[model samples]
Target: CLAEGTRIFDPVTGTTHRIEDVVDGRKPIHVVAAAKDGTLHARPVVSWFDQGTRDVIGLRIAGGAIVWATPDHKVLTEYGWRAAGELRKGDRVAVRDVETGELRYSVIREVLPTRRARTYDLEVEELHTLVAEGVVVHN
Candidate 1:
């Protein structure tokens, strides 16, 4: 789950919305997702999960992407999907170029503990993944 105000990349709007905003009203939404081949696509979010308040962490990626997620949130890494708490400083995470719609990778620069706050997660169709703050993460 992600903390409130965490931005999720929405390809339809070509902008990022706070995770809280996207899940509002529980309506279906579209977001940028990464395919197994690392290609990017616009995918539908079928449902949202309100995780309530939980322990979260701030992950700073190499290219200025900041992700605030629960320690157990699954993040896409070079080897495979791993929990945010299990990631290290040098691990690579997938990133999407919002401007050009390109896919890339960035190294995790830091992982700092953050406050307990309302958190949320969503289920993306097919891929079951979405880009949060431009970083790829599992549903």
Candidate 2:
């Protein structure tokens, strides 16, 4: 569960946003918390911020995040993998679809793991994407 000052990462713009304002109603999840770090977290969390100012009091994670991948197809960027079986589904994985050349979100689907060759499906998060873009927009 996220609190009032949790730091959320936006995979799209690679921006680090912090929870600023909050609105807690009479219920549990009704407690809506906005951004405070100069409006960075809530900025992109909603995905429809065309007016420069947004109020997303109803945001949900749904499941684990997806990762960006390289064009390798078999491999993921930042040293990650797309596994299967129990590791399939919600697990975060990287991908570069035919539509965009850049890294995109991809979750685990099938199980290709055997036994001793498990290392072949290991990888690291592409934090370089955050660093290479510019500076870590800390908020």
Candidate 3:
């Protein structure tokens, strides 16, 4: 019972969707990864690119096929899967974004000024990472 181009706004998320399902939050979505079997990640996330650290996630969309050290930027098939786009070599940028829905792997905007910037972990585990800790630091 709605008209076209009517954005369904999510007050909690501070964003609106054109034709998205708004039920408190987005649901988990499945994706194929490198030798890791089909896994599920929270979609509609804010894909973030963190500076001063090293972290990688997703293959095609998240990082978009990482090319380690090729003249033309070709990735080694044996190096497993990597994200696309080259990260800042010195800045050490890491990206984390929502998977689907409105944002769909877009970098989070409201995350900054916190992180203390003293914490640095090379491990790319979503569950264990202190990405959320940045929120606490800011909040």
Candidate 4:
């Protein structure tokens, strides 16, 4: 049995915790959120599950952006799909073309790099959106 004081780190929640008490419900976990803009939003993750089979017992996300765990992981950028580290301020992002179907570029005002190797999908989904949208415009 995992007694209290057993330290555990969760990538999804962006927190490390020494179990205060092992009560089997949803315990609060601090998580970080990356907004559409390059801003970081800190929040609490209040839901978790436990399984007895696999050594690694945690919620295994199946599909969609929710499954992504690391922002530092390779993600397509406006500059022909670049790493988050490869992007910087003033870098031109391919947003909506002001003129026609031709893709245009927009200047990045700021950049908040995800330092951890496994950042969090909720943190960088917005950046992914920018890359996915062919003709996109943002301020």
RMSD of each: 1.4, 17.1, 15.1, 14.9
- lDDT (10s digit) by residue, model 2, range 14-108: 34443232112211111111222211111212211111222211111123222221212232222343222223434443332323324444444
The per-model lDDT (C-alpha) reads 0.85, 0.25, 0.22, 0.32
Off by over 4 Å in 4: 1-70, 73-79, 98-102, 113-139
Total clashing pairs for each candidate = 0, 10, 20, 4
lDDT of 3 at 22: 23
Which candidate comes out best when scored by TM-score?
Answer: 1
Error of 1 at 42 (Å): 0.4
lDDT of 3: 0.22
lDDT of 1: 0.85
Query: What's each prediction's TM-score?
Result: 0.92, 0.22, 0.17, 0.28
Candidate number with the higher lDDT (2 or 4) = 4
**lDDT tens digits, residue span 17-60, model 1:** 78887777686779988898988899999988888889899899
- What is the overall TM-score of model 4 with all chains considered together? 0.28
Q: Native-vs-model 2 lDDT?
A: 0.25
lDDT winner between 2 and 3, please give it: 2
Full candidate order by lDDT, most accurate first? 1, 4, 2, 3
**After superposition, candidate 2 runs with Cα above 4 Å error:** 1-87, 113-139
